[PDB]
Design a protein around this ligand. Sequence first.
Ligand SMILES: *[C@@H](C(=O)O)[C@H](O)C(=O)N[C@@H](CC(C)C)C(=O)NCCC(C)C
Length: 212
Amino acid sequence: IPEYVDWRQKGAVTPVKNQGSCGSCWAFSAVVTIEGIIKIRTGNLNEYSEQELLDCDRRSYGCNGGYPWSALQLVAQYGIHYRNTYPYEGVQRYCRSREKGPYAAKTDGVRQVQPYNEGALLYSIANQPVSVVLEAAGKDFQLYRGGIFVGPCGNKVDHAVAAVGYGPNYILIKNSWGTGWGENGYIRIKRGTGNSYGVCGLYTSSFYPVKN
Ligand SMILES: *[C@@H](C(=O)O)[C@H](O)C(=O)N[C@@H](CC(C)C)C(=O)NCCC(C)C
């Protein structure tokens, strides 16, 4: 795999979103990987509905948090609508997929990246954007304005984001805290420290959609 990967340069990443006060990071994270893999397979970059996963993934807890892997399974089992059709409201409502016509996209499954393995994660990112989790509760993460982030942070992962690239010394992360945070909404987190958990627990739990 290459020394640098940046899925934004291959037109596979949509604009940075702001999840607002809702703990919907798991849905935002999942959607980034769906947007990425649909562009990779079909050549079209579309925005898909975080709100639909928020409303419809019964294994997750709406704005109280949830699981990127369960949202990803939902899109593989059923499908997902365009964001325009099912826009983000920042609050869990009832599942409205059936009121909004045919799904816009469907995936074929969900894979887990071997945890605690930097190389396995980089290999996955070289193929497509990946949903990853990290500890974002720390003030250093929250106040991040740029640079390669080394922490401090622990491994109490609490925040799903999407890895959309990497370099020799970082993994490039699309956050869902709006374009004012970090590097226009992105963070570069240091890699290659030998910490099996990854910086801020980044290697704890990583999933990506499969699309044939
Ligand atoms: C993340 C956000 O900032 O919106 C959101 O709070 C969330 O979904 N957090 C989850 C932790 C990640 C590891 C996905 C979470 O806490 N999920 C709850 C499910 C378990 C019982 C922890």
